[PDB]
Amino acid sequence: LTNLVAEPFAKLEQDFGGSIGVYAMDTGSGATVSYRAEERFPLCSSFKGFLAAAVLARSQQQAGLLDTPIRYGKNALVPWSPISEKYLTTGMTVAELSAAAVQYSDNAAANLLLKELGGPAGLTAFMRSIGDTTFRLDRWELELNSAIPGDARDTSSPRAVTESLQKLTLGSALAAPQRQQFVDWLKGNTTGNHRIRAAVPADWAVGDKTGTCGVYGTANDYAVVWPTGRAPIVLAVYTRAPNKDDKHSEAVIAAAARLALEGLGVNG
Ligand SMILES: *C(=O)N1C[C@H](NOS(=O)(=O)O)CC[C@H]1C(=O)NC1CCNCC1
């Protein structure tokens, strides 16, 4: 059921000047679209969705966790912390940091939550606990964005991202209340309007998390999409390119998402 219908991903990535990795899963039939799906790509900010899921999993064993107020100093505010900078003088709850990390890609929030989990290895351990043997987080913000060609640090594959996203949003990896909270955070993302969402009709529900390393043409998005009248679709689109100064493209991500939906026979 993989690649029943071929799609022109090679032409797309050639025009982009790099590599595109796509995995998409029709959760009803099990049909998939797969292109470079087992190659590694840098996560960039996209690890923050899984980070929030890991916090929610922890909160199943610690009922007070989400409501815990976290204070932080100015030294915690690394570049691109649009929410946590507004609450420097007050603090934010763990839930609020999680929402900020997911929905605004807040870097300070992400580092504060990584500390809660025992750092990159703690997040990696959570991913292992749900059966993901590919994911690895190695570094913190901002160093995890280096996106060096051939460097496996801070990478996963489109396939493993999609498989893990499915487990967390639709499967049983989270308890039902936590699962719905994760979904709701993804649905409220503000940074993805020009990526997978641009390929998804407005009358379908969708949650996503983006990433943009800023070098090596490296950017990404993953999403859970609910077309009306059929089972949900899970998909991941990752990009990279050979040169440090190569630019990312949101349009290429949206175009790859459209090809994936077309390959699954999902009318969009
Ligand atoms: C994540 O990839 N981020 C955080 C933020 N928005 O994330 S996104 O998914 O909407 O793109 C800005 C881009 C990126 C990030 O942390 N960029 C840093 C800029 C400075 N150099 C290190 C990377």
Author numbering: 25 to 57, 59 to 252, 254 to 294
Paper text:
SBLs hydrolyze antibiotics via formation of a hydrolytically labile acyl enzyme intermediate, while MBL catalysis proceeds without a covalent intermediate. The diazabicyclooctanes (DBOs), including avibactam, relebactam, and others, are a new BLI class with improved activity against a wider range of SBL targets than classic BLI scaffolds. DBOs inhibit SBLs through covalent formation of a carbamyl ester to the active-site serine concomitant with DBO ring opening.
Consistent with this possibility, in the KPC-2, KPC-3, and KPC-4 structures, inspection of electron density maps indicated the presence of desulfated relebactam, which could be modelled as the imine form of the inhibitor, with occupancies of 0.35, 0.33, and 0.65 for KPC-2, -3, and -4, respectively. The imine group points toward the flexible Trp105, but otherwise, the DBO core closely resembles intact relebactam. However, in the KPC-2:relebactam complex, both Trp105 and the relebactam piperidine ring are modelled in two conformations. Therefore, movement of Trp105 and binding of the piperidine ring appear linked, with the potential for steric clashes to occur if Trp105 was positioned to face the C2 side chain. While the flexibility of this residue may be allowing the KPC-2 active site to accommodate relebactam, the necessity of rearrangement to avoid these steric clashes likely contributes to the decrease in potency of relebactam compared with avibactam. However, in each of the three KPC complexes, in all of which relebactam was a modelled as a mixture of intact and desulfated forms, Lys73 is at least 0.4 Å more distant from Ser130 than is the case for either the CTX-M-15 (either conformation) or L2 structures. These increased distances, when considered with the postulated recyclization pathway that involves proton transfer from Ser130 to Lys73, in addition to the distance of at least 3.5 Å between Ser130 and the N6 of relebactam, suggest that recyclization is less favorable in the KPC complexes than in those formed with the other two enzymes.
